[PDB]
């Protein structure tokens, strides 16, 4: 086509979606990771994660307001990944990289799994 | 912080949100622009438009599944802007620029209003 494109649009949309999450506006699901609860927007979770895409395209699960993750999932790892979904920034540290990578494999977030593998390889 | 950032994340999120819209997945509102109907995600509309942000933060309107726009709004202008919200690309043409600018002023999409004003000024 002959369209023009606003370079910062996608980043500005994501920033506004994170502001809605902050302010708990139109959040429609609670993700439970053992004793912790995280509120989010189903559409953002599906856009970032192959696991959430599969969950919320299921004719029964699409209607659930609470999703319980596998008890082996680390709440801090999930929190770091949820922040990444809404900001593009990943708080990857020596002390959390193993939990983050395991969580990203479970959530099916291939680009995160890729950077974790590279950072681990560099330390070996 | 000491975060790393995935450059293409915001663009990839927006591309996936547009794929959900295409496939009518988790769309939660119908916008009526006279005889036409457009299905969308309230969160994407709020993230892009000051008018939708004001509508869906209202304690009564946040619960509506149908929103009727002012009868003066052109459906093609709205369609072009809805596509821009989900893709960052604006199909601006000599034949639609006046309707697009009027719609963007109504929807409170300041960056679109800005490029329309510049394109109009260039033709004068």
């Amino acid at each position: 086509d002959s369209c023009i494109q606003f370079t910062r649009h996608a980043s500005d949309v994501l920033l506004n979606l994170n502001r809605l999450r902050s302010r708990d506006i139109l959040t429609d699901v609670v993700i439970v990771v053992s004793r912790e609860q995280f509120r989010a927007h189903k559409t953002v979770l599906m856009a970032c994660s192959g696991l959430f895409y599969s969950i919320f395209t299921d004719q029964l699960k699409c209607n659930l307001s609470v999703i319980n993750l596998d008890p082996e999932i680390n709440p801090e790892g999930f929190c770091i990944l949820l922040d990444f979904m809404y900001t593009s920034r990943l708080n990857l540290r020596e002390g959390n990289i193993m939990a983050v990578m395991a969580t990203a494999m479970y959530l099916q977030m291939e680009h995160v799994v890729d950077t974790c593998r590279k950072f681990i390889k560099a330390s070996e | 912080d000491s975060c790393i950032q995935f450059t293409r994340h915001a663009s990839d999120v927006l591309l996936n949100l547009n794929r959900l819209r295409s496939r009518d997945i988790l769309t939660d509102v119908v916008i009526v622009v006279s005889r036409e109907q457009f299905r969308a995600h309230k969160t994407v509309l709020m993230a892009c438009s000051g008018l939708f942000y004001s509508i869906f933060t209202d304690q009564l309107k946040c619960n509506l599944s149908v929103i009727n726009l002012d009868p003066e709004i052109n459906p093609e202008g709205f369609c072009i802007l809805l596509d821009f919200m989900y893709t960052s690309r604006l199909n601006l043409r000599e034949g639609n620029i006046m309707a697009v600018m009027a719609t963007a002023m109504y929807l409170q999409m300041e960056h679109v209003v800005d490029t329309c004003r510049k394109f109009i000024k260039a033709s004068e």
Partner: peptide
């Protein structure tokens, strides 16, 4: 704004 750019030409994509």
């Amino acid at each position: 704004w750019v030409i994509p």
